[PDB]
Design an enzyme around this catalytic site. Structure first.
Site, mmCIF file in Angstrom:
data_model
loop_
_atom_site.group_PDB
_atom_site.id
_atom_site.type_symbol
_atom_site.label_atom_id
_atom_site.label_comp_id
_atom_site.label_asym_id
_atom_site.label_seq_id
_atom_site.Cartn_x
_atom_site.Cartn_y
_atom_site.Cartn_z
ATOM 1 N N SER A 57 0.825 -1.294 0.196
ATOM 2 C CA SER A 57 0.258 0.214 0.151
ATOM 3 C C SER A 57 0.892 1.283 -0.364
ATOM 4 N N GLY A 95 -4.271 3.133 -2.498
ATOM 5 C CA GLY A 95 -4.722 1.794 -0.796
ATOM 6 C C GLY A 95 -5.420 0.762 -1.845
ATOM 7 N N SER A 96 -6.526 0.999 -2.064
ATOM 8 C CA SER A 96 -7.481 -0.079 -2.834
ATOM 9 C C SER A 96 -7.212 -0.398 -4.037
ATOM 10 N N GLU A 147 -2.939 -14.848 2.867
ATOM 11 C CA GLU A 147 -3.521 -12.871 3.733
ATOM 12 C C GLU A 147 -5.549 -13.321 4.195
ATOM 13 N N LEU A 168 -22.569 -6.151 28.415
ATOM 14 C CA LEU A 168 -22.525 -5.353 30.006
ATOM 15 C C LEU A 168 -22.578 -3.920 30.261
ATOM 16 N N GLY A 187 -23.161 -0.631 31.020
ATOM 17 C CA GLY A 187 -22.399 0.685 31.501
ATOM 18 C C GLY A 187 -20.908 0.420 31.927
HETATM 19 C C1 LIG Z 1 -3.457 -1.614 10.589
HETATM 20 C C2 LIG Z 1 -3.313 -1.305 9.507
HETATM 21 C C3 LIG Z 1 -2.394 -1.953 9.048
HETATM 22 C C4 LIG Z 1 -2.161 -2.201 7.643
HETATM 23 N N1 LIG Z 1 -1.474 -3.152 7.476
HETATM 24 C C5 LIG Z 1 -0.998 -3.220 5.580
HETATM 25 C C6 LIG Z 1 1.027 -3.579 5.666
HETATM 26 O O1 LIG Z 1 0.698 -4.615 6.047
HETATM 27 N N2 LIG Z 1 0.644 -3.953 4.017
HETATM 28 C C7 LIG Z 1 0.240 -3.331 3.172
HETATM 29 O O2 LIG Z 1 0.091 -2.939 2.049
HETATM 30 N N3 LIG Z 1 -1.121 -2.420 3.555
HETATM 31 C C8 LIG Z 1 -1.805 -2.605 5.318
HETATM 32 N N4 LIG Z 1 -2.018 -1.525 5.690
HETATM 33 C C9 LIG Z 1 -3.238 -0.760 3.973
HETATM 34 C C10 LIG Z 1 -4.336 -1.379 3.879
HETATM 35 O O3 LIG Z 1 -4.648 -2.297 2.900
HETATM 36 C C11 LIG Z 1 -5.148 -0.014 3.338
HETATM 37 O O4 LIG Z 1 -5.578 0.357 4.777
HETATM 38 C C12 LIG Z 1 -6.530 -0.500 2.302
HETATM 39 O O5 LIG Z 1 -6.425 -1.590 1.809
HETATM 40 C C13 LIG Z 1 -6.890 0.437 1.273
HETATM 41 O O6 LIG Z 1 -7.394 1.591 1.943
HETATM 42 P P1 LIG Z 1 -6.815 3.458 1.728
HETATM 43 O O7 LIG Z 1 -6.624 3.259 3.256
HETATM 44 O O8 LIG Z 1 -5.893 3.660 1.043
HETATM 45 O O9 LIG Z 1 -8.512 3.375 1.636
HETATM 46 P P2 LIG Z 1 -9.093 3.939 0.319
HETATM 47 O O10 LIG Z 1 -8.814 2.966 -1.026
HETATM 48 O O11 LIG Z 1 -9.278 5.401 0.085
HETATM 49 O O12 LIG Z 1 -11.018 3.574 0.328
HETATM 50 C C14 LIG Z 1 -11.608 4.924 0.579
HETATM 51 C C15 LIG Z 1 -12.954 3.925 0.374
HETATM 52 O O13 LIG Z 1 -13.757 3.678 -0.343
HETATM 53 C C16 LIG Z 1 -13.714 2.673 -1.073
HETATM 54 N N5 LIG Z 1 -13.656 1.723 -1.882
HETATM 55 C C17 LIG Z 1 -12.298 2.477 -3.077
HETATM 56 N N6 LIG Z 1 -12.440 2.216 -4.207
HETATM 57 C C18 LIG Z 1 -13.611 1.207 -4.378
HETATM 58 C C19 LIG Z 1 -14.248 1.447 -6.061
HETATM 59 N N7 LIG Z 1 -13.530 0.844 -6.841
HETATM 60 N N8 LIG Z 1 -15.606 0.816 -5.432
HETATM 61 C C20 LIG Z 1 -16.089 0.775 -4.101
HETATM 62 N N9 LIG Z 1 -15.867 1.627 -3.255
HETATM 63 C C21 LIG Z 1 -14.090 1.807 -3.217
HETATM 64 C C22 LIG Z 1 -13.111 1.691 0.182
HETATM 65 O O14 LIG Z 1 -14.478 0.669 0.403
HETATM 66 C C23 LIG Z 1 -13.564 2.807 1.373
HETATM 67 O O15 LIG Z 1 -14.982 2.689 1.516
HETATM 68 C C24 LIG Z 1 -2.898 -1.642 6.684
HETATM 69 C C25 LIG Z 1 -3.877 -1.049 7.125
HETATM 70 C C26 LIG Z 1 -4.200 -0.633 8.292
HETATM 71 C C27 LIG Z 1 -5.315 0.536 8.809
HETATM 72 C C1 LIG Z 2 -22.892 8.688 30.044
HETATM 73 C C2 LIG Z 2 -24.035 8.335 30.452
HETATM 74 C C3 LIG Z 2 -24.115 9.278 31.583
HETATM 75 C C4 LIG Z 2 -25.634 8.745 32.444
HETATM 76 N N1 LIG Z 2 -25.811 10.204 33.463
HETATM 77 C C5 LIG Z 2 -26.705 9.483 34.726
HETATM 78 C C6 LIG Z 2 -27.855 10.967 35.429
HETATM 79 O O1 LIG Z 2 -27.127 12.029 34.910
HETATM 80 N N2 LIG Z 2 -28.606 10.147 36.258
HETATM 81 C C7 LIG Z 2 -28.575 9.348 36.697
HETATM 82 O O2 LIG Z 2 -29.549 9.056 37.041
HETATM 83 N N3 LIG Z 2 -27.636 8.205 34.980
HETATM 84 C C8 LIG Z 2 -27.095 8.078 34.551
HETATM 85 N N4 LIG Z 2 -26.622 7.269 33.723
HETATM 86 C C9 LIG Z 2 -27.177 5.772 33.938
HETATM 87 C C10 LIG Z 2 -27.218 4.781 32.712
HETATM 88 O O3 LIG Z 2 -29.121 4.587 32.476
HETATM 89 C C11 LIG Z 2 -27.374 3.663 32.906
HETATM 90 O O4 LIG Z 2 -25.480 3.076 32.911
HETATM 91 C C12 LIG Z 2 -28.124 2.393 32.197
HETATM 92 O O5 LIG Z 2 -29.343 2.476 32.871
HETATM 93 C C13 LIG Z 2 -27.967 1.647 32.074
HETATM 94 O O6 LIG Z 2 -27.137 0.695 33.860
HETATM 95 P P1 LIG Z 2 -26.239 -0.201 33.985
HETATM 96 O O7 LIG Z 2 -24.567 0.028 33.629
HETATM 97 O O8 LIG Z 2 -26.413 -0.690 35.025
HETATM 98 O O9 LIG Z 2 -26.423 -1.035 33.080
HETATM 99 P P2 LIG Z 2 -27.540 -2.761 33.915
HETATM 100 O O10 LIG Z 2 -28.938 -2.792 33.489
HETATM 101 O O11 LIG Z 2 -26.553 -3.933 34.293
HETATM 102 O O12 LIG Z 2 -27.373 -3.750 31.617
HETATM 103 C C14 LIG Z 2 -26.709 -4.793 32.322
HETATM 104 C C15 LIG Z 2 -27.034 -5.554 30.536
HETATM 105 O O13 LIG Z 2 -28.983 -6.482 30.937
HETATM 106 C C16 LIG Z 2 -29.824 -5.836 29.720
HETATM 107 N N5 LIG Z 2 -30.538 -5.485 31.007
HETATM 108 C C17 LIG Z 2 -30.894 -5.649 32.539
HETATM 109 N N6 LIG Z 2 -32.795 -5.164 32.383
HETATM 110 C C18 LIG Z 2 -32.737 -6.423 32.138
HETATM 111 C C19 LIG Z 2 -34.261 -6.849 31.832
HETATM 112 N N7 LIG Z 2 -34.928 -6.871 32.901
HETATM 113 N N8 LIG Z 2 -34.673 -7.432 30.692
HETATM 114 C C20 LIG Z 2 -33.645 -7.327 29.252
HETATM 115 N N9 LIG Z 2 -32.901 -6.859 29.639
HETATM 116 C C21 LIG Z 2 -32.220 -6.395 30.965
HETATM 117 C C22 LIG Z 2 -29.438 -4.391 29.818
HETATM 118 O O14 LIG Z 2 -29.872 -4.182 28.827
HETATM 119 C C23 LIG Z 2 -28.122 -4.448 29.601
HETATM 120 O O15 LIG Z 2 -27.166 -4.710 27.784
HETATM 121 C C24 LIG Z 2 -25.667 7.604 32.818
HETATM 122 C C25 LIG Z 2 -24.962 6.481 32.534
HETATM 123 C C26 LIG Z 2 -24.094 6.874 31.394
HETATM 124 C C27 LIG Z 2 -23.506 5.860 30.399
#
Ligand SMILES: Cc1cc2nc3c(=O)[nH]c(=O)nc-3n(C[C@H](O)[C@H](O)[C@H](O)COP(=O)(O)OP(=O)(O)OC[C@H]3O[C@@H](n4cnc5c(N)ncnc54)[C@H](O)[C@@H]3O)c2cc1C
Ligand SMILES: Cc1cc2nc3c(=O)[nH]c(=O)nc-3n(C[C@H](O)[C@H](O)[C@H](O)COP(=O)(O)OP(=O)(O)OC[C@H]3O[C@@H](n4cnc5c(N)ncnc54)[C@H](O)[C@@H]3O)c2cc1C
Ligand SMILES: Cc1cc2nc3c(=O)[nH]c(=O)nc-3n(C[C@H](O)[C@H](O)[C@H](O)COP(=O)(O)OP(=O)(O)OC[C@H]3O[C@@H](n4cnc5c(N)ncnc54)[C@H](O)[C@@H]3O)c2cc1C
Ligand SMILES: Cc1cc2nc3c(=O)[nH]c(=O)nc-3n(C[C@H](O)[C@H](O)[C@H](O)COP(=O)(O)OP(=O)(O)OC[C@H]3O[C@@H](n4cnc5c(N)ncnc54)[C@H](O)[C@@H]3O)c2cc1C
Lengths: 374, 377, 374, 375
Positions: free
Chosen positions: A131, A136-137, A242, A330, A332
């Site tokens: 690349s 890239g692509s 790959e 999980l 929060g």
């Molecule tokens: C963590 C990481 C590790 C990597 N390691 C390696 C490595 O070891 N060796 C190596 O050679 N490369 C490596 N790469 C490069 C990697 O292969 C490129 O990120 C990717 O293959 C090329 O895309 P780009 O980043 O140029 O984005 P672009 O090619 O600009 O893509 C942008 C968007 O346009 C879309 N698009 C592009 N062409 C078309 C088309 N003809 N039709 C429709 N949609 C299209 C794509 O799907 C994408 O959504 C690495 C990249 C990352 C992120």
């Molecule tokens: C950025 C942020 C800001 C917040 N700010 C406030 C605030 O200002 N004031 C405040 O009071 N609170 C606040 N909260 C609390 C927030 O509403 C809780 O984190 C959220 O309601 C989930 O609680 P929990 O982490 O205990 O999830 P859990 O209840 O532990 O959820 C565990 C998993 O089980 C699922 N689950 C739980 N019960 C049931 C059931 N009876 N049936 C089926 N599935 C279930 C849930 O979907 C969840 O995927 C905030 C949270 C965030 C992330």
């Protein structure tokens, strides 16, 4: 920590390999996963340890320290490794498959003897450079120059997004010899070769990625890999394999998703939750089935561009979806960096871009189907 | 930067408000959004600035210095702010809706005059505390002379470590034994825990609160003792409506980053926006943006009419939250490798978006609420 | 026919089985598929024919005329059959797996001797009656002497109107017992065939038992042990039935691929359009992943491994995928896909049955989610 | 029973009154024959005069010609209630009242509107629109000969094709922007309809090819100017898309109509999954309504964009299909029988992802517009 699942009957050898890699990964990798993400640095000691366990040359010849196994085996190792750290998994894949496997398949006896042993012990780290910033692509539009000058090819230009870029001692580099393409074996110690500073990525933060810069980099003519102008063939096959092996990255991420979710829910019977869990389990298992079937097919010598592209397309999208569900289950806590769910999301997204994007995979499969069915 | 979209004809006052907030957000908020995410802290100097612009008391009564506007207006403000920084948006929402609006709706005149003025100017920051680690809540309020004593903890509180005024729900009688209280940072026995280390919304300060025999005058009872469940429920409806504009601003930001990239990135000799799959991806983003907006604005308007909207408020946040996260994933996808780097904000948009599928009630809880109410009436 | 795809290397025997079943299916079943759907009637002559091929007893003991094969083979046969006609496939599955296999597994040698030979030859049709309009089943079997007297009803029974031999679950004490019931037993009557969205060639009815006498030597698996008998092979049922959706998916590609070459808009075959290639890619990948998963589960069953979660999982998965793929099939054909001149509409109508019949997606998710704890 | 909960959109007393009226007609008159229209594969012709009498056929037509003079929001609401009772009748109605009548109302000269609109509005005449061909690269030829254009070729997939008295027909007047729209009468010699199609759904909506063999069209029957046909066609497609999007709306409303009452009286954690599914249906319904109504109101302000019209039908059509699948799921075995209407809702819904231009075409149109808009 979640170890139920459908048995695939991969055979005793691969089962032993799995138990070995899983033990190594839980003991030596998993404790460092968070740290690698936080420090944005690959834990270098792993290179030799994986070398010592025979993982680095797993599909490379036994002449050079390799294990002489196949792509299904490689998939299993990649899966256990990525299960402990997706970052280490990605670096490992890039070294062991992108670099080592291309050398093993396209390298001459002399070249393989020269470069493989240190790559396989982990004394040397390997990378693959294809690349470029403007290619890239559309990879065949690459602009890295390679001009013949005496018994040397002088390389000028840059490569980008290279996994293991800052660390690689040995690299497979594609360059235009006639703007067409040739693959070269490049040593870090070649004058005129430099790595940029590591990138600051959303995920895969344990995986050192960089640009590469070639300024009058002299490569011996005996370091051409697979013949002048035949770089596109080498590249293409390289992408197939790959694809199959890297699709096990998503597999490992999915396994990790269940690893955090199931025990969590047991320390913290609601119905929507059980349904969510079911979808994760079934997805995981279908993805495993598909990837293993493709890998076994590759091992039988039926490599189709279609199915390799297909299993990475499928697995990558599923791994991202499932990481989202891991955070969701999980709650929060899943939104905090105190749990690894967030990192699993950040890591998983890479596989929908790297190794060619989802879009490029879909197009390859479509065009190929349409081409072979006419 | 991307300004295509369906005209909803919200009127001149709302159009002008959108213009003011957009100017403020782009000039002031956006250039510090990365910094807020990186330092994992709210830029405190924004409070007074938002105070000056009249944003903090946007639905509060003019008698107490508020703007006296409605939920449609508030959604628009929240959207434009979130578009610039989703963290700033979340903090803003918690202050101006969860806290200020609860006080405006439920407070007696004297509670409103005592607490609203500094909340509206921004000299004071506001929060709301309901959630606990375990409406089976456990935070205890016991009467002691002419005061109430609070014991227990609240978790996940936006603006938690900074809030000077808090709306807090507590058990006065263990069901219909819930009571809401106005609490000051100044009251002894009140403290905030360390700030949380979150995947996203990192510029929004979140922590637990710990109440250790925290003394609240009986005159700080919000909406009547034993009546806390009503205050809480209504609060949740309005919270969901206004917070759903958070996902809207994130979606708007997804388009802001993606569209100029589609034009400027070339592959295969063409801007990647000319490729069929990318056009499709773009189309889906656009349609989703417009439908989500239509739904949210319709729900807010119904609220401004004073209609019932429990199902519909849960619904518009359920919907928007899920869509915003999906769209941020596509924004990263459309940008490719660049979109996977922290030099671009797409990753931040994803990390921030996921918050809304948990925080302020989860997707699951929203689904169950909606379905239960349907199955009954 | 679209005959491309991943090779799974199932072995010479299963491959020959696939070939024979496919020849039979295209020659004898496919020309009747439309007619079966239009007349809402099973083409009865297929019974003896399938009997002659050894298909009806594919997993039954050889001593009774069965093939003595396993669940992987049965899935392949079911797949090739359903690919020619989903209704025929559903009826075939109910006869050969839900009925015949249950007798083969839980039947005393005398019982198998009495009932299997005609079922295997196709001289008799088989069915399973478990579902009732309302473990909360109300069909009661009262012991009066050397006879159990059956009173109540069963609903939605595949092959209901034609079945000569039925495995029927009833409450002997409110507790459950399975019985072998003969069409000829007095007091047994089948209701008229249902008028269904799809699976129209598959004769479904209610059953009514009014003082139906069943001799005690027709108890299947032991009094009060009906729930063990049922639970067992709900599993095998799920595995084998999941090949219904597999056949349908294969059929979707069978219609879509040729059309994508022949239809031309804007100066090109529609298959050259990028969104079309995307869609076709998603179909192909889905087909291969689903096959991989079902074959892996079936092979796990043949090794005698437990697979409650995975059997439920593979039918959950494959049923939802088949319906989605039939929808895309209609999409790919355009206006023509919307006419009854083409089979796509029928494929959609048929596919929906598997998410809703023989269990439901919701039940499968809860089962998986509960057994995975929770 | 019916499900009548939902977000209030405050569309005004005129539109709320129209809604009550049409819903009454739809549940009383149309719903009881929906299954008959489906089984017999035939539109119930007697509905035409009745819809004429209710003022529905010329709902967006000028009052001077007998029409209601209302707009696109109003038309969407009518379309929605009708489609809620029978999607087939809704598609035939949409084709008559928007595809034909509205094109004539917008593009017709005063004399053309006077001649053709009154019988179409009262329902004495049925209207159709013909543009698609088996192969804007259509092949239908219109050769000018004296004071008449001679039409040769065929059209395909025409809704109301076998019954149409008046059709708007597009043809090439020059195979080199050489498209012209025409007003064609069934009575014109050399015009005929093919046999009606045998369709997966929309079976109560008569659909056929049209065949023109030296069909003589008066030159005064040119609609909107010679060579200007592409304009007429495109705008026609925008409004077609907005109004037809209410077809999926009605289908979704029908899904809830069949599901919510059923979920009550059916009694066996699958029910919590069920509540989630019901929640998603409800939310989806309300979202699609909000979007379609927003686009339509925008059209009534004079703001019509290719993007938003295409967007709302793309969105609504996909949603209605998914929801019909869920309606079947929710009703289980019963949902899979033809004795319940859920199977029919699915079969019908699928049509809107193809007709009026496929989802693929809509996506491309939107993307190309956005790209052009932001360069
Ligand atoms: C963590 C990481 C590790 C990597 N390691 C390696 C490595 O070891 N060796 C190596 O050679 N490369 C490596 N790469 C490069 C990697 O292969 C490129 O990120 C990717 O293959 C090329 O895309 P780009 O980043 O140029 O984005 P672009 O090619 O600009 O893509 C942008 C968007 O346009 C879309 N698009 C592009 N062409 C078309 C088309 N003809 N039709 C429709 N949609 C299209 C794509 O799907 C994408 O959504 C690495 C990249 C990352 C992120
Ligand atoms: C950025 C942020 C800001 C917040 N700010 C406030 C605030 O200002 N004031 C405040 O009071 N609170 C606040 N909260 C609390 C927030 O509403 C809780 O984190 C959220 O309601 C989930 O609680 P929990 O982490 O205990 O999830 P859990 O209840 O532990 O959820 C565990 C998993 O089980 C699922 N689950 C739980 N019960 C049931 C059931 N009876 N049936 C089926 N599935 C279930 C849930 O979907 C969840 O995927 C905030 C949270 C965030 C992330
Ligand atoms: C073509 C066909 C062939 C069949 N053949 C046979 C056969 O050979 N033998 C046989 O025994 N049966 C047979 N059946 C019966 C079949 O198993 C049932 O129709 C179906 O699988 C069970 O659902 P139901 O039809 O009772 O609808 P319901 O179960 O009432 O479904 C209503 C909805 O509620 C949910 N729900 C269902 N049960 C519960 C619960 N306990 N708690 C909470 N929620 C719930 C479901 O998810 C469903 O979406 C057949 C059915 C069909 C359609
Ligand atoms: C019930 C019904 C009623 C109808 N009524 C009318 C009417 O009243 N008046 C009228 O004029 N017409 C009518 N039609 C025709 C309708 O407009 C057409 O069916 C539609 O416009 C195109 O469908 P087609 O059969 O040409 O599909 P095709 O054009 O053959 O499409 C086949 C597939 O190729 C894909 N495809 C085509 N081009 C591209 C591209 N450039 N990029 C990506 N994908 C592409 C499509 O998405 C589709 O999936 C009706 C159709 C139906 C089914």
């Amino acid at each position: 920590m979640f170890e139920a699942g459908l048995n695939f009957a991969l055979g005793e050898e691969i089962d032993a390999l799995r138990a070995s890699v899983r033990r190594f990964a839980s003991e030596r990798i998993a404790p460092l996963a968070d740290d690698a993400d936080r420090s944005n640095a690959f834990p270098m000691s792993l290179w030799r340890e994986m070398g010592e366990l025979g993982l680095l040359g797993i599909t490379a010849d036994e002449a050079h320290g390799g294990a002489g196994l196949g792509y299904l085996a490689h998939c299993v190792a990649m899966e256990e490794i990525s299960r402990a750290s997706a970052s280490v998994g990605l670096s490992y894949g890039a070294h062991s498959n992108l670099c080592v496997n291309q050398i093993n398949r396209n390298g001459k006896p002399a070249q393989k003897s020269r470069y493989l042993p240190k790559l396989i012990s982990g004394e040397h780290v390997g990378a693959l450079a294809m690349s470029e910033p403007g290619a890239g692509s559309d990879v065949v539009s690459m602009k890295l120059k390679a001009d013949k000058r005496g018994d040397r090819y002088v390389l000028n230009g840059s490569k980008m997004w290279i996994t293991n870029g800052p660390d690689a001692d040995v690299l497979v580099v594609y360059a235009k010899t006639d703007p067409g393409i040739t693959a070269f074996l490049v040593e870090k110690a070649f004058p005129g070769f430099s790595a940029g500073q590591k990138l600051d990525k959303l995920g895969m933060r344990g995986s050192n990625t960089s640009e590469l810069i070639f300024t009058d980099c002299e490569v011996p003519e005996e370091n051409v890999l697979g013949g002048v102008g035949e770089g596109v063939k080498v590249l293409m096959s390289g992408l197939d394999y790959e694809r199959v092996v890297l699709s096990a990255g998503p597999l490992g991420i999915m396994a990790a998703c269940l690893d955090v979710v199931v025990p969590y829910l047991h320390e913290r019977e609601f119905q929507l939750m059980q349904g969510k869990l079911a979808d994760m389990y079934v997805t995981m298992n279908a993805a495993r089935a598909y990837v293993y079937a493709v890998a076994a097919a590759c091992d039988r010598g039926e490599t189709a561009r279609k199915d390799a592209a297909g299993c990475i397309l499928y697995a990558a999208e599923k791994a991202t979806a499932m990481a989202l569900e891991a955070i969701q289950a999980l709650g929060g806590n899943g939104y905090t960096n105190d749990y690894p769910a967030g990192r699993l999301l950040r890591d998983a997204k890479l596989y929908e871009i790297g190794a060619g994007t989802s879009e490029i995979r879909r197009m390859l499969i479509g065009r190929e189907l349409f081409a072979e069915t006419k």
